[PDB]
Amino acid sequence: PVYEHLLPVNGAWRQDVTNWLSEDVPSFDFGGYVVGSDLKEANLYCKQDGMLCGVPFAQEVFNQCELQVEWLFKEGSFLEPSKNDSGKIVVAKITGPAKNILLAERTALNILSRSSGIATASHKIISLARSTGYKGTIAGTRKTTPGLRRLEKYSMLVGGCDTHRYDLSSMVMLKDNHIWATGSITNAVKNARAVCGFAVKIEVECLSEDEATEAIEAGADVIMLDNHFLLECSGGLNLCDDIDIYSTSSIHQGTPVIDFSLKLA
Amino acid sequence: PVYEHLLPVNGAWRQDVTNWLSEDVPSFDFGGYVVGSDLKEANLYCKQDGMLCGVPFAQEVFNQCELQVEWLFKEGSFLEPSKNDSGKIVVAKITGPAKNILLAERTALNILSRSSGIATASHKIISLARSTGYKGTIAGTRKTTPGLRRLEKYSMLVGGCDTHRYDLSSMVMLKDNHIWATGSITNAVKNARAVCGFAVKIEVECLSEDEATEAIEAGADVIMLDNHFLLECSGGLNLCDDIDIYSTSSIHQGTPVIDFSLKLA
Amino acid sequence: PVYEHLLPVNGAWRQDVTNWLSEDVPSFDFGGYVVGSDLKEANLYCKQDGMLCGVPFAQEVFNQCELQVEWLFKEGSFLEPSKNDSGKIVVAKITGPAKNILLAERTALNILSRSSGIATASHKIISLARSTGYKGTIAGTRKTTPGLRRLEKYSMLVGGCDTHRYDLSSMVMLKDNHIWATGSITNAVKNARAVCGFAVKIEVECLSEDEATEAIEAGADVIMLDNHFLLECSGGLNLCDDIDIYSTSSIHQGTPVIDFSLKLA
Amino acid sequence: PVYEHLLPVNGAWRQDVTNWLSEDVPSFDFGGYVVGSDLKEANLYCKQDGMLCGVPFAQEVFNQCELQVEWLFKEGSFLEPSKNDSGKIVVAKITGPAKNILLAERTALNILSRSSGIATASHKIISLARSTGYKGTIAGTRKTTPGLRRLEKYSMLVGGCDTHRYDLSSMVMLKDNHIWATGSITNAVKNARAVCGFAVKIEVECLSEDEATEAIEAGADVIMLDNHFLLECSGGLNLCDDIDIYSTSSIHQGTPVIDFSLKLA
Amino acid sequence: PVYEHLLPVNGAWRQDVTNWLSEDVPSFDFGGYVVGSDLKEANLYCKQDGMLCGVPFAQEVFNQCELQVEWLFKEGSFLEPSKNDSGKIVVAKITGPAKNILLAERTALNILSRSSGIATASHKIISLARSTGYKGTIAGTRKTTPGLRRLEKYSMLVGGCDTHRYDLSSMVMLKDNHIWATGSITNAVKNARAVCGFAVKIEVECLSEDEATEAIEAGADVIMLDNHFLLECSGGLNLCDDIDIYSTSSIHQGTPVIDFSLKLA
Amino acid sequence: PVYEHLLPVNGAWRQDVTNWLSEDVPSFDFGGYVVGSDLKEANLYCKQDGMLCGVPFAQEVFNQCELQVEWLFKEGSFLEPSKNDSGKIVVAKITGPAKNILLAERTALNILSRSSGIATASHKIISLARSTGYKGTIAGTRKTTPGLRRLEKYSMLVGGCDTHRYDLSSMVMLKDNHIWATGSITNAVKNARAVCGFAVKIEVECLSEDEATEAIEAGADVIMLDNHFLLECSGGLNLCDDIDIYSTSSIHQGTPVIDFSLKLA
Ligand SMILES: O=C(O)c1cccnc1C(=O)O
Ligand SMILES: O=C(O)c1cccnc1C(=O)O
Ligand SMILES: O=C(O)c1cccnc1C(=O)O
Ligand SMILES: O=C(O)c1cccnc1C(=O)O
Ligand SMILES: O=C(O)c1cccnc1C(=O)O
Ligand SMILES: O=C(O)c1cccnc1C(=O)O
C-alpha cells in the first residue's frame, strides 16, 4: 500500500498548503519579480541521514506552484548522505518558472525537514524497542504542533509507530477527574459509552490493580497504568515489559529536524 | 513595554486559536460530557527549567474556553523548578467549568511548551554569544513551522533574539539566482529597489570582496557572506567576528520543548 | 435551457463541496489506503422511482475527486426502476482510482438522494395541483436545511415549483409585527420601499379585506392571506381557489429521500 | 450528564451558526429595518408531538443575535401539544430588540424542527425495538445531510440511538472492494490495522460464515452481515435476532420534521 | 427608522471588519508595542463638508478593538467644518488602551472617508435632480468596489439614492445577448421568469418602441432604454424626462472621499 | 521584469477573486441560465485615456470563469482611445461559454477600471513631479480601500510611484504619541528597534530641527517633517524641495476610474 493514499484526493489539508504559501507572501514576492519566469531546473537535496517523509505535502506545494517534480526515492526511504562523496543526496528533480521554484522552496523544505525528523525519530524508537524483542507497539500523543496535527500523525505512521488517538473526538480517554466526577470508574465508563457507542474505544487511566479491574468490568477497551482489553504505559523514554502499548511524545515532539536544500542548475 | 502588545487586539491569530480547538474536536468532546460543568480550580505547572513564553496565546485559548486565569509570572521570566522541592512550579491558577478546563488543556500546553522551548533556546544562544563580548545580533530565519510563524517569531523576540525578516514580502533577499538573472548584482538590486521602494531593505548574499562592494554601490542595505550597510553571516552554530548579524535556525527550529502540565484541585 | 447553468462556473458552492469532503475525512482515509489507486469502473444506481436532481453538485464532488463520469440521464428525468427487471437503474458510469471513487461515494449519494427527493416531492405537488386545472403557482419557503439552501432551492426549481423568495435580502415580507411597528401597513410598506427600492418586491401578510387594500394602495407587490399585485395563500397541503401563489414547505422540508447506490465493477 | 456538553465551548460549530445567518442575509435585512430595535417579548412554540432537540444550536443562534432566552423544557423532553387545549406549547421565552428576534427566528426554527424530527424518529425506533426485549443497539449511518453531520449525529444521541461511526477517519469499514484489493480479508484487515492502530476499531462486511471467521481471526472488531467481536446487520427497517447492532438511515435520513413557531407578544 | 438596522446583528460583514484589521497587521503591531495600553482619550474629526456615513462599520472596528465610543452626530448628518472656526468637527469621542486606538484608526478612517464620500455624492445627485421637480428616482449600479459592495450600497441608501439591484441573483437584467439567445425578448423573459419566479423582477434593456412593447407583453417588470411596468435610462450624468429611474455609477464609483482624522488628547 | 510576477503563483489574492464572484452571485445566475453555454467571442474595450492596470487580477477572474483571453497590450501601457476613430480600444479578445463571459464581465471590469484609475493618477503625479527635475520619489499611504490593499498598492507601482510602507507590520512609523509614551524620541525609537530589529526601517515624524536630529541619533531610518537617513514630507498635492519622499493619498484614494466595457460579437 501507499501511505500518501491516507490523504483524501481533496480536503482541508490542501487548503493548509495554500495558507502556508500566503503566510510567506502577505503582499508581494519581490524576489520572484527580479528572477522572472524563465524555465529552470532544480535538485532537492537531503543533507542529513534520516527517513524521507512529507512527500505528498511537499508535492502539493510544488503542484500549487505549478512545477514538475520527479522524486528519486519512495517516501519512507532511509537516506544516508553519510558518504559525503558529496555530503548530500538528490531526492527530487524540479522544473518550472524561476520565480515559482523559489516561492515553493522554503515552505516545501520546512515541511520535509520537520516531517522527516518526526519519521526518523519515530523509526528510531520503534526499531530500537523492537530489537529487544518487544512485540507490543510504540505510540504517540496529542502533544502535537498546533495546526500541524495531520502532518505529524502522518509522519508517525511512516516512521513505523502508532499514532495513538487522533483527537478528543476519537477514542475516549478517562482520568481520575472524570471518574469521581460521576462516582466511580464504572459510571465514568458507562457515561462515556453512552455517548461514544460501540464504534469507539474507551481508555481509562488507572494507578492500581483493583482500579484496572473495575474498568475492565465496566467495559473499558484500554487501561493506562502510566509511569478484550489492552494495556498501556505512558511516558517511558529509556523498561519494556509485556504491556501492549508504550506512549511517548518523544517520537514527534521536540525532535531534531532533517536538513534539506534546493538549488537551481 | 509589553511583548504581548505586538499582537493586535484582534486579527487572524485569534482565529488560529479557534482552529486549533477545532483541530482537537472535529465532532464531540466525549470527556467533557462525562466530566460536566461544575466549577473547578486548576494549577498550570512548569516542569522544566526554561523561559516562559506564549502567554498571550495560551490566554486566548483560556479566554475562548471561558475560564478565569491568573498568571503568577510575567512572560519572559526564567523558571527553575530546579529545586524539586517539588520539581515543578505553578505559573497560573485557572477556574471554570470542569469540561472547559480539560478542553483548553492540551492545546494551551502545546503552545506553552513549544513557545517556551523556542524562547529558551533563543535566549541561550544570545546570552551565550553575548558573554563573549559580542555586540552584534543573533537572528532567526524563515525555516519556521508551517502555519505557526507568528508564534515562533514572537518567541524569538521574547528570547532576546532578532526575528530576522518575517517573510518574502518583507526585506528583499537576493542571491546568485536573481543576480545573473538580470545581468549583475547591480541590476538585481536595482529591480528589487524598483518594486520594494525606500520603505524596505534589500539584502544580497555574496561570497567575495568585489561582490559585496558592487552590492554596496548598488544600494543594498545588508550583505550576507554566508559560512549605510550591515554585514551578516549565516549558518553559524558554535567564530564570532565583528559582523553585525549571525543567522541560525538553531534558536527556533528543531529545538527541545519545555514541559508543562495542568491539574485540577 | 439548462438548470445547472444557474450555478456560477465558480463561487462558494464549489467550496461547499470541498467542505463536505472535509466533513467526511477530518484526518485520514483508512479505506482509501487499503484499496489503492488502481483504476476502476463503477455504476451509479437509482433504486427508487423519482426525479433525478443534484447532478451538477454530485459532478463537482466527482470532479474534485478526479474521476471521469458519464451521466446516462439528463437532470430532471423521471426514473422508474419500477420494473425490477433488476430493481434499479444505472444513471452514471464512473472511472478513476479505486480510493477516489470510494471517497466521493457517500457524499455524492447524500446529495443525489436528498436533491432528488426534494425535486420529486416538488414535482408531485405541482403536477397534482396542475391536474385540477389550477393555473397559479406552487412555491416553497425559507424553512430550508441550514447551510443547504442553494441546493434545496435549486431542487425546487428542477421539480417544476417556484422557489419563492431566496432569503431576507430578497423580496421584503412584512407582517403585523412590522405593521404596527410603524403605525400602519402604509408606513411599514413605505419604510420597506424606502430601503429596498424599485428592484425588489414587497409582500404584506394580511388577514382581512381592508388590510389587503391598504397594502395595495401603499405599493405592496404581493399580499399573503395565509390559511399590479398578486395574491398568495400559505400553508395549504391538501382548496385551490384562483389565488396566484400557494406556499408550502411540503415540497422541500421533511421529504422522503430517493435511494441511490454506487458499485465498482 | 448533559448532552450539550458534547459540544466544545468553542469550535467550528459556532462558526456554522454564523454562516447560517449569513446564508439568510447576504446583503441587508429590510424587515429588521422596518421593525426596529424596541425590546420585545416572544414565545417559542412547539406545534407537534415529539422530542425536543437542537437546543444548544438554537441557543447559539439566539446568543449571536444578542437575545435573552429561558427554556421551559430540558433537551430530550417529549412534548405533547397533543392536548390543543391550545394545540401548542411554549418551550422558551425570548427577549431582545425586535429586529434581532425576527432575524434569529427562521434559522433557529429550522434547526429545532429538523433536530427534533431526527431525535423523535431515533427514539421511536429504539423504544420500539426495545419493547420487543431486544438488548442490542440501533445505530445510524453516514448518510447524513451534507454540512449538517454534527447536528444530526448529536440528534441521534439525544433520541437514544447509537451514532455509529462518525466519518471515514473513525472506525475503519472494509468491504469486498478492499478485501480482494489486497488478496484476502486478512490482508485488508492487516493493512487497515497497519494505519489505524489500536485506538480505532476495524469493521468488515461479510456475507457468509467462513468470511466472518477469517475476519475475526484477522483482528476485526466488528462484522457486518448486511441484510472480542460484535455483530451488525444493516438496512433493517421492520427481524430482531440477537445481533449486537442494527444499522438504519431511517432514524435520521428523510425523516418528518417537528413544527415549531415563534411569536412576539 | 435606523439605516444601521439593515445590517444583521451578526453575519459576514463583521468578519469583513476582522479581515480588514488582519490586512493591516499580518504579523506584529510594532507601534502598539511602543505606545502601550494606558487608557487614552481621542476625538474623531471630520475635516471636509459632506454627509456622515459608515458609522456602523467604523463602530464594529472600534468594538473589535475594544474601545468606548460616543458619536456626536447621527449617521446621515451633513457636516460643515466649513466654518474653520477650527476647520474640523469632532464627530466622536473615543476611549481605550493607547495601542487599541492607534490600531483601529486607519481602518476606521478608511471606512468613514469612503462611505461618506459615496453618501455625499449620492445625496448631491438626488437633491440636485430633485430640485428640478423630478419625482422619479436616481439609482446606482453593479460597478462597485470588489469586496466592498455591502458598504457602498449601504452608503448609496444613506445618501438618499436607490441602490438598484444588489447583484446577479437579484432582479434579472436581460440584454440583446440573452434576447436572440432564445429567439426573442419574449423567450428570454419567459426563461428568466421560469427560474426567478414571481418573487423577483425582470428588467429588459431595449432600444426601440416595439422592443419595449414586446417586453411588456412578455411580462417584464422594468424596461431600460439606455442613453405594471417602470422605465429606466442608464448613463446619464448631466435630461430629466418623466422616466421612473435614472441609473449612474456616478453616485458611488470614482467619487471623492471625505477627509477624517483621529487624535489622542 | 514583469510586474505581475510580484503576485505569488498561488496565495490569498486568488481566493479574493473567488470571493468577488460569490459577492456577485449569492444564489443563482438567472442571466447565465437564459443565455446558455454556446461558445462566444468578446472584445474588452478601454473607453478612456489612461494607463492599463489590473491585468493579472482580471485574468484570474477570466481563468476561474474558464475563458480564453488574449491581451492586445502589455500592462502599464498608456491607451488613448483619444482618437474616437471609434472612441475606444480593444485591449483583449475573449472566448468561452456565453454564460461564463457575462459572469466574469462586471467583476473583471470593476477591477480594471479601478486599478487603471489608480495607476493613471499615480503616473500623472510622478511624471508631473518629475518634469520639474525632481529626483526624489512620490509615495502612497495606508489610506487604501478596505480589503483591496494588495490591488491598489500593486497599481501604485505600475503607475511608477512608490507604495510606501505596506502595513503596520512593515516599516515602523512613530509619532508624538509613541514618543512621549516612552519619554523621548530616543526611547520610542529604541523600543521600536527592540522589536522590529535590523530587517525593518523605523520612521519618525518630527516638526522641528532638534527633534529630527535626536531621531537620527537614535537610529531612525526616515524622518517625516509633514506639511544613513532619508527625509519625507507628507500631504503635498500641488513645493518640491530636495526632500527624498513626498507622500500623498492622491495617487490612490478618491481617484477617477478608467472606463472599460465588454461586448460579445
Ligand atoms: O491525549 C492523548 O491522546 C494522549 C495519549 C497518550 C499519552 N498522552 C496523551 C496526551 O496527549 O496527553
Ligand atoms: O529567508 C530568510 O529570511 C533567511 C534569513 C537568514 C538565513 N536564512 C534564511 C532562510 O530562510 O533560508
Ligand atoms: O419567509 C419566507 O420566505 C416564507 C414564504 C412563504 C411562506 N413561508 C415563509 C417562511 O419561511 O416562513
Ligand atoms: O458508512 C457508514 O458509517 C455506515 C454504517 C452502517 C451502515 N451504513 C453506512 C453507510 O454510510 O453506508
Ligand atoms: O448590472 C446592474 O445592476 C446595472 C444596473 C444599471 C446600470 N448598470 C448596471 C451595471 O452594473 O452595468
Ligand atoms: O501610515 C502610513 O503608511 C502613511 C505613510 C505616509 C503618509 N500617511 C500614512 C497614513 O496612512 O496615514
PDB file of N, CA, C and O and ligand atoms in Angstrom, chain C residues 139-144 149 153 163-168 171 173 175 203 224 232 234-235 247-249, chain D residues 105-106 110, ligand 3:
ATOM      1  N   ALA C 139     -45.229  27.316  -4.467  1.00  0.00           N
ATOM      2  CA  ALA C 139     -43.943  27.838  -4.105  1.00  0.00           C
ATOM      3  C   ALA C 139     -43.408  27.213  -2.845  1.00  0.00           C
ATOM      4  O   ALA C 139     -44.150  26.663  -2.090  1.00  0.00           O
ATOM      5  N   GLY C 140     -42.114  27.332  -2.616  1.00  0.00           N
ATOM      6  CA  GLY C 140     -41.531  26.979  -1.351  1.00  0.00           C
ATOM      7  C   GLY C 140     -41.465  28.072  -0.304  1.00  0.00           C
ATOM      8  O   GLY C 140     -42.245  28.977  -0.322  1.00  0.00           O
ATOM      9  N   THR C 141     -40.539  27.919   0.622  1.00  0.00           N
ATOM     10  CA  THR C 141     -40.408  28.719   1.807  1.00  0.00           C
ATOM     11  C   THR C 141     -38.948  28.951   2.150  1.00  0.00           C
ATOM     12  O   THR C 141     -38.091  28.670   1.383  1.00  0.00           O
ATOM     13  N   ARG C 142     -38.717  29.459   3.342  1.00  0.00           N
ATOM     14  CA  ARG C 142     -37.400  29.685   3.843  1.00  0.00           C
ATOM     15  C   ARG C 142     -37.064  28.641   4.903  1.00  0.00           C
ATOM     16  O   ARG C 142     -36.069  28.704   5.549  1.00  0.00           O
ATOM     17  N   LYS C 143     -37.917  27.659   5.043  1.00  0.00           N
ATOM     18  CA  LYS C 143     -37.688  26.637   6.005  1.00  0.00           C
ATOM     19  C   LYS C 143     -36.794  25.581   5.416  1.00  0.00           C
ATOM     20  O   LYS C 143     -37.112  24.440   5.398  1.00  0.00           O
ATOM     21  N   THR C 144     -35.656  26.010   4.924  1.00  0.00           N
ATOM     22  CA  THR C 144     -34.672  25.115   4.322  1.00  0.00           C
ATOM     23  C   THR C 144     -33.697  24.548   5.351  1.00  0.00           C
ATOM     24  O   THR C 144     -33.683  24.964   6.511  1.00  0.00           O
ATOM     25  N   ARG C 149     -29.307  25.714   1.591  1.00  0.00           N
ATOM     26  CA  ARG C 149     -30.349  26.432   0.864  1.00  0.00           C
ATOM     27  C   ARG C 149     -30.192  26.487  -0.653  1.00  0.00           C
ATOM     28  O   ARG C 149     -31.165  26.327  -1.383  1.00  0.00           O
ATOM     29  N   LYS C 153     -33.196  24.931  -2.973  1.00  0.00           N
ATOM     30  CA  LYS C 153     -33.964  25.860  -3.799  1.00  0.00           C
ATOM     31  C   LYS C 153     -33.816  25.384  -5.241  1.00  0.00           C
ATOM     32  O   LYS C 153     -34.781  25.312  -6.009  1.00  0.00           O
ATOM     33  N   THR C 163     -39.415  28.807  -6.252  1.00  0.00           N
ATOM     34  CA  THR C 163     -38.597  28.796  -5.070  1.00  0.00           C
ATOM     35  C   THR C 163     -39.196  29.632  -3.969  1.00  0.00           C
ATOM     36  O   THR C 163     -38.875  29.477  -2.823  1.00  0.00           O
ATOM     37  N   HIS C 164     -40.085  30.529  -4.338  1.00  0.00           N
ATOM     38  CA  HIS C 164     -40.334  31.707  -3.563  1.00  0.00           C
ATOM     39  C   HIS C 164     -39.043  32.438  -3.180  1.00  0.00           C
ATOM     40  O   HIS C 164     -37.978  32.026  -3.533  1.00  0.00           O
ATOM     41  N   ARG C 165     -39.175  33.522  -2.442  1.00  0.00           N
ATOM     42  CA  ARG C 165     -38.060  34.365  -2.066  1.00  0.00           C
ATOM     43  C   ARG C 165     -36.837  33.580  -1.565  1.00  0.00           C
ATOM     44  O   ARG C 165     -36.973  32.631  -0.826  1.00  0.00           O
ATOM     45  N   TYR C 166     -35.649  33.934  -2.013  1.00  0.00           N
ATOM     46  CA  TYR C 166     -34.482  33.164  -1.627  1.00  0.00           C
ATOM     47  C   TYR C 166     -34.121  33.349  -0.155  1.00  0.00           C
ATOM     48  O   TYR C 166     -33.888  32.368   0.561  1.00  0.00           O
ATOM     49  N   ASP C 167     -34.086  34.601   0.294  1.00  0.00           N
ATOM     50  CA  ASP C 167     -33.740  34.915   1.679  1.00  0.00           C
ATOM     51  C   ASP C 167     -34.395  36.210   2.169  1.00  0.00           C
ATOM     52  O   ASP C 167     -35.371  36.686   1.585  1.00  0.00           O
ATOM     53  N   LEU C 168     -33.852  36.773   3.247  1.00  0.00           N
ATOM     54  CA  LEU C 168     -34.372  38.014   3.828  1.00  0.00           C
ATOM     55  C   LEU C 168     -33.859  39.251   3.096  1.00  0.00           C
ATOM     56  O   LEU C 168     -34.325  40.361   3.345  1.00  0.00           O
ATOM     57  N   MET C 171     -37.058  39.603  -1.710  1.00  0.00           N
ATOM     58  CA  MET C 171     -38.358  40.223  -1.513  1.00  0.00           C
ATOM     59  C   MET C 171     -38.653  40.497  -0.042  1.00  0.00           C
ATOM     60  O   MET C 171     -38.463  39.630   0.810  1.00  0.00           O
ATOM     61  N   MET C 173     -40.852  40.802   3.170  1.00  0.00           N
ATOM     62  CA  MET C 173     -42.092  40.171   3.605  1.00  0.00           C
ATOM     63  C   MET C 173     -42.487  40.763   4.948  1.00  0.00           C
ATOM     64  O   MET C 173     -41.904  40.434   5.980  1.00  0.00           O
ATOM     65  N   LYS C 175     -45.135  41.673   8.123  1.00  0.00           N
ATOM     66  CA  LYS C 175     -46.184  41.063   8.933  1.00  0.00           C
ATOM     67  C   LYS C 175     -46.762  42.090   9.904  1.00  0.00           C
ATOM     68  O   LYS C 175     -46.407  43.269   9.862  1.00  0.00           O
ATOM     69  N   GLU C 203     -43.940  42.217   0.004  1.00  0.00           N
ATOM     70  CA  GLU C 203     -45.106  41.377   0.243  1.00  0.00           C
ATOM     71  C   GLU C 203     -45.618  41.611   1.655  1.00  0.00           C
ATOM     72  O   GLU C 203     -44.835  41.642   2.604  1.00  0.00           O
ATOM     73  N   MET C 224     -50.220  38.309   1.179  1.00  0.00           N
ATOM     74  CA  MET C 224     -50.404  36.964   1.696  1.00  0.00           C
ATOM     75  C   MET C 224     -51.638  36.977   2.581  1.00  0.00           C
ATOM     76  O   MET C 224     -51.765  37.819   3.473  1.00  0.00           O
ATOM     77  N   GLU C 232     -51.401  35.427  -2.506  1.00  0.00           N
ATOM     78  CA  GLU C 232     -50.821  34.173  -2.064  1.00  0.00           C
ATOM     79  C   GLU C 232     -51.409  33.651  -0.764  1.00  0.00           C
ATOM     80  O   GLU C 232     -51.783  34.416   0.123  1.00  0.00           O
ATOM     81  N   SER C 234     -50.702  30.749   2.217  1.00  0.00           N
ATOM     82  CA  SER C 234     -49.641  29.936   2.728  1.00  0.00           C
ATOM     83  C   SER C 234     -50.135  28.940   3.734  1.00  0.00           C
ATOM     84  O   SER C 234     -50.613  29.310   4.767  1.00  0.00           O
ATOM     85  N   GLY C 235     -49.780  27.687   3.477  1.00  0.00           N
ATOM     86  CA  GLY C 235     -49.722  26.601   4.432  1.00  0.00           C
ATOM     87  C   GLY C 235     -50.213  25.317   3.802  1.00  0.00           C
ATOM     88  O   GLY C 235     -49.938  24.207   4.259  1.00  0.00           O
ATOM     89  N   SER C 247     -48.077  28.690  -1.009  1.00  0.00           N
ATOM     90  CA  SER C 247     -46.794  28.354  -0.407  1.00  0.00           C
ATOM     91  C   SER C 247     -46.901  27.212   0.572  1.00  0.00           C
ATOM     92  O   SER C 247     -47.826  27.170   1.383  1.00  0.00           O
ATOM     93  N   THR C 248     -45.951  26.284   0.492  1.00  0.00           N
ATOM     94  CA  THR C 248     -45.929  25.151   1.397  1.00  0.00           C
ATOM     95  C   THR C 248     -44.530  24.569   1.493  1.00  0.00           C
ATOM     96  O   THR C 248     -43.887  24.315   0.480  1.00  0.00           O
ATOM     97  N   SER C 249     -44.063  24.367   2.720  1.00  0.00           N
ATOM     98  CA  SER C 249     -42.746  23.799   2.962  1.00  0.00           C
ATOM     99  C   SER C 249     -42.739  22.312   2.624  1.00  0.00           C
ATOM    100  O   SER C 249     -41.695  21.654   2.682  1.00  0.00           O
TER     101      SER C 249
ATOM    102  N   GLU D 105     -35.235  33.999  14.280  1.00  0.00           N
ATOM    103  CA  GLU D 105     -36.388  33.126  14.103  1.00  0.00           C
ATOM    104  C   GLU D 105     -36.441  31.929  13.156  1.00  0.00           C
ATOM    105  O   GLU D 105     -36.681  30.802  13.587  1.00  0.00           O
ATOM    106  N   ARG D 106     -36.245  32.184  11.865  1.00  0.00           N
ATOM    107  CA  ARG D 106     -36.336  31.133  10.856  1.00  0.00           C
ATOM    108  C   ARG D 106     -35.157  30.170  11.007  1.00  0.00           C
ATOM    109  O   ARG D 106     -35.347  28.956  11.012  1.00  0.00           O
ATOM    110  N   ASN D 110     -35.493  26.349  12.002  1.00  0.00           N
ATOM    111  CA  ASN D 110     -35.070  25.368  11.005  1.00  0.00           C
ATOM    112  C   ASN D 110     -34.194  24.323  11.677  1.00  0.00           C
ATOM    113  O   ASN D 110     -34.143  23.170  11.250  1.00  0.00           O
TER     114      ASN D 110
HETATM  115  O1  LIG G   3     -40.061  33.530   4.722  1.00  0.00           O
HETATM  116  C1  LIG G   3     -40.424  33.111   3.602  1.00  0.00           C
HETATM  117  O2  LIG G   3     -39.778  33.288   2.546  1.00  0.00           O
HETATM  118  C2  LIG G   3     -41.723  32.309   3.514  1.00  0.00           C
HETATM  119  C3  LIG G   3     -42.522  32.446   2.383  1.00  0.00           C
HETATM  120  C4  LIG G   3     -43.759  31.812   2.330  1.00  0.00           C
HETATM  121  C5  LIG G   3     -44.165  31.050   3.421  1.00  0.00           C
HETATM  122  N1  LIG G   3     -43.383  30.930   4.482  1.00  0.00           N
HETATM  123  C6  LIG G   3     -42.182  31.522   4.570  1.00  0.00           C
HETATM  124  C7  LIG G   3     -41.315  31.230   5.796  1.00  0.00           C
HETATM  125  O3  LIG G   3     -40.107  30.964   5.616  1.00  0.00           O
HETATM  126  O4  LIG G   3     -41.873  31.219   6.914  1.00  0.00           O
END
